[PDB]
Design a protein that fits this description.
The chain is mainly β. Helices cover about 10% and strands about 30% of the residues. The chain is built from one helix and six strands. The protein has one helix at about 30-40, and strands at about 5, 10-20, 20-25, 45-50, 60, 95. It starts with a strand and ends with a strand. The structure holds magnesium ion (2 copies). One magnesium ion binds near residues 28 and 91. Homotrimer; disulfide-linked. Trimers may assemble in larger oligomers thus resulting in the creation of a large surface capable of interacting with very large ligands.
Amino acid sequence: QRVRIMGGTNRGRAEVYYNNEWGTICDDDWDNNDATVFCRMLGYSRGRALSSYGGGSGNIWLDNVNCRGTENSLWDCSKNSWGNHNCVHNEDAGVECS
Ligand SMILES: [Mg+2]
Ligand SMILES: [Mg+2]
């Protein structure tokens, strides 16, 4: 269950490792609860959702992520099935963690 931030230091595009590849997360309904779960996987306390951070390539793995904000992992969150999306990479979600 691997995640990474690509862009800056405490902010960047939210990427997830699945199906043997680092892929991106479409921003449809991506909010602070989702960003918070994601940031907490990387040792931050909380996150703000960045809509259309953009700039990723390859597979878009997730869309319509619906975390309560309390999960220990993104994998425990309600979300579309893996690789099910109607997105482009301009719409890649990001996070600003603290
Ligand atoms: Mg959209
Ligand atoms: Mg959501």
